[PDB]
């Protein structure tokens, strides 16, 4: 899971888990 860029802003307690060339659509590192 990752904090990738979001073009929209979020609201309080909003849970949204659903243009920068080709980098908007993808979405941690365990080492």
């Amino acid at each position: 899971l990752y904090r990738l860029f979001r073009k929209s802003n979020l609201k309080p307690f909003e849970r949204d888990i659903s243009e920068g060339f080709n980098c908007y659509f993808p979405l941690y590192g365990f080492q």
Binding site: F5, K7, E19, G20, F21
Partner: protein, 42 residues
């Protein structure tokens, strides 16, 4: 050379950045909100 161009008191347009080439790599700033940025020195 590197780190030679000082940017200030200028219109820091980003259209020339994100609409260029087909060249961006904006880490530290918001990519689609670049035109809303302002810094002490660039």
């Amino acid at each position: 050379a590197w780190n030679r161009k000082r940017i200030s008191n200028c219109v820091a347009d980003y259209s020339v950045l994100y609409n260029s080439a087909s060249t961006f790599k904006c880490y530290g700033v918001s990519p689609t909100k670049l035109n809303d940025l302002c810094f002490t020195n660039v």
